[PDB]
Each structure stands twice: as C-alpha cells, then as structure tokens.
Amino acid sequence: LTALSPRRFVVLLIFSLYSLVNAFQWIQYSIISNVFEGFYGVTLLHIDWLSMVYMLAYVPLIFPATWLLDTRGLRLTALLGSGLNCLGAWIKCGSVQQHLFWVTMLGQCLCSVAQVFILGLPSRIASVWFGPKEVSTACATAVLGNQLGTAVGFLLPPVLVPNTQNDTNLLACNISTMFYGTSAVATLLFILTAIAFKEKPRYPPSQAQAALQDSPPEEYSYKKSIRNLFKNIPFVLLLITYGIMTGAFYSVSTLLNQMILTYYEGEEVNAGRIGLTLVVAGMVGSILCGLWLDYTKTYKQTTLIVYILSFIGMVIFTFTLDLRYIIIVFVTGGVLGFFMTGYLPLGFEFAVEITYPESEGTSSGLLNASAQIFGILFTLAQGKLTSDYGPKAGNIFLCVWMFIGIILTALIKSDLRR
C-alpha cells in the first residue's frame, strides 16, 4: 500500500527555506568582505576564512554526520541542521562590535556545522517523502534552494550594508539589521521544523521505500564503502574534476568582492548583482539540463562539453575584467556561471552512473567533500595571488586548473544514456 501525504510539500518547502538561509550565511560575509575588513580591523584573509570554515567543517564531519542520519532518523538531522543554523545566526547578532570578530567566527562555525546536516538531505528527503515521478523534481528543487540562498546572499548584503566606513555607528546598525533579520528567519524556520517536520510519512510513497521499510540494512561499514570508491578509477577522476569545478565556484564567490573592487571602486552593489547573475544563470543551466542529454549524447560527452565551456567562460571572464566596463562583467559573469555552476547537478548525476552497487550517500559525501577541499586550496591560493599580483594572476590560476580538469574529464570512461 503506497500513499502520498500532502505534508511532503510542507517538508520540502521548509527544508529548502532554511537551506536557503544556511547558504545565505555562507556568502553574506564574502560579498561585502571589503566592508567587514574595516569594521573588525582584520585583514581580508580572516574575512575570507569566514567562508572557508563552511568548507573546512564539512570534510571531517560529513561521515560521522552521515552515520547519524541513517541510524537516528531524518528528523533529528533536520532539527540539528536547522537548529544549529538558527543558533549560529544568533551568536552573530551579538557579535556586531569592532573588537568581537571571533564571536562572529564562532557563530559562523556553528553555521558551518549546520551545513553538514543539510547538503546530503535533498537526496534523502525526496526519496523518503515523494513518489517515483516526483523524486527527481523534489531533489532538484531542494538543491536549487541552496543555490538560491547564495544568489540571495550575493544580492542583499550590498544593499543592506552600505560601505560607510566614515561612520562606525551607522555601519554597525546596518550589520545588526542583517544578522537580526537572518536570526529571526532562521529561528522561525527552526520552530516550523520542530512542529511540521515528521520522521516518516503515513505510508511509504513507492515500492522502493516500501521495500526499505521491511529491511533496514544498518551497519553499512562506511569505511569499507569509501575504500571501494577510491578503487573505482573513473570515479576518482570524476571526484577530482567535480572538486575542481565546484572549488572554482567557491573560490570565485568568496573572492568576487576583492576582484571586482580592485578595478571597480565603489561598486559593491554591482558586485552582488554579478554574483546573483552568476548563480541564477547556473540555475537556468541546471533546469535546462536533461535537454542537454539528447538521444545522441551521453553523460561523458555532456560532462566534457560543459567543462570546456566553463573553461572558456573563465578565460573570457578573466581577460575582460580589466576593461573597466561593468556591463561586460555582467554578461561574462552570467556566461561563466551558466556552465560552471550549472555543472554541479551534472556532476552528481554522473556519479550515480559510475557507482551503482554502492550507496548514493557515501558517493555524495565524497563529492561534496572534494568540493570543500578544493575550495579551500583555491580560495587560499587565489586569495594570495590576487593580493600580490592582482586578480588576473589569481583568475589565471583558475583557468590552468580547469585546463587540467578537461584532461581528467576526458579519461573518465562510461557509456549510458539518460
């Protein structure tokens, strides 16, 4: 007996909203990194580290948090992920002072831990709650909610927080408004998660869930599973390439303010709009995907083609930033984001092909962890290069790595249609 409950729309909508807020908090500091730099008196590296802690906390905690999900239920992860997102925001609201940077970092660290109970959820939530015809749509919608948070995270802080460095009191009030508004939204979604969210629906939605209801595996031995994936040579190459692509997105998003403000003085608002254009175009590319894989293509061919366009899009973006025309950055930022951030759904769906006899959660964790590891290295390396030799040197460093990614993408061997 399979039944669909109307609560699944509430569950998916509630999760996507606080996943949106969690991604909002990740990039809210980087987009106005030039503003937070003068408020706390710290260097850009410290403000840059407010974004890497999202990546740094994910790598070790992903597997213990994954073990928490399949052994204690999905609701507890939702309570912990949304609860820590709310708690981390409230610590930030009390950190609005010129000498309380570490309180902001402590609050951001809790939000970094909140991301661990968030990124793997969309695959689980769609399968547990939705029917076979809605699993793909629900999973994509939840994933796009995280991307929407970054797009909102790009747009709002430049508007909410003007760069009024001459007036410290006015700057603190605007920053407090952003954190209080984020705290209230996160707190409300935490309360809604407490009431509306349930461990399991009334009845299994599909035969696969009904089968999983009568035979829970338990003790999956994640250590054995990760070792097998590292022996799957196509997967390891795809693991490196996806980290290069997603790590490039994290590095560009984190350092977007510094590169843009180097040539475009006093254009923080435009920097946020460019960041929104970069992410929204990838959402368009993400939605337009599937039509990419026609009857004459495959996952391998689509993966390589998008990687080439992403590499070219970075080259055009890199070599047109110095032209001192903000309108050119908009069209090049959208073109770069259409393929670079539109590849992320394709990277995951490609991994479901290489590793069928292994759990999707373990591969999903490694793919995300690869993004975090490469994101940290790219943000550190590009941030250093941008500081001494300008944005072009840091951006060229990205083109070379994406050049490496194209070769590594070509050596991945697999054949199957949609």
Number of separate strands: 0
Give helix and strand order, one letter per element, not per position.
HHHHHHHHHHHHHHHH
CATH class of the largest domain: Mainly Alpha
The helix content, as a percent range, equals: over 70%
What is the overall silhouette?
globular
Strand pairing plus helix content: what structural class? Answer: mainly alpha
What is the beta-strand fraction?
under 5%
Distance between the termini: 29 Å
Stated plainly, the CATH topology of the largest domain is called Growth Hormone, Chain: A
Can you summarize the main beta sheet?
A: none
Q: Any idea what the CATH superfamily of the largest domain is called?
A: MFS general substrate transporter like domains
Give the count of structural domains: 2
Radius of gyration, rounded? 21 Å
Per CATH, which architecture of the largest domain?
Up-down Bundle
Number of helical segments with 4 or more residues: 16
GO molecular function: choline transmembrane transporter activity; ethanolamine transmembrane transporter activity; heme binding; heme transmembrane transporter activity
Family: Belongs to the major facilitator superfamily. Feline leukemia virus subgroup C receptor (TC 2.A.1.28.1) family.
Catalytic activity: choline(out) = choline(in); ethanolamine(in) = ethanolamine(out); heme b(in) = heme b(out)
Extracellular side: 26-43, 94-100, 161-166, 264-267, 322-324, 389-390
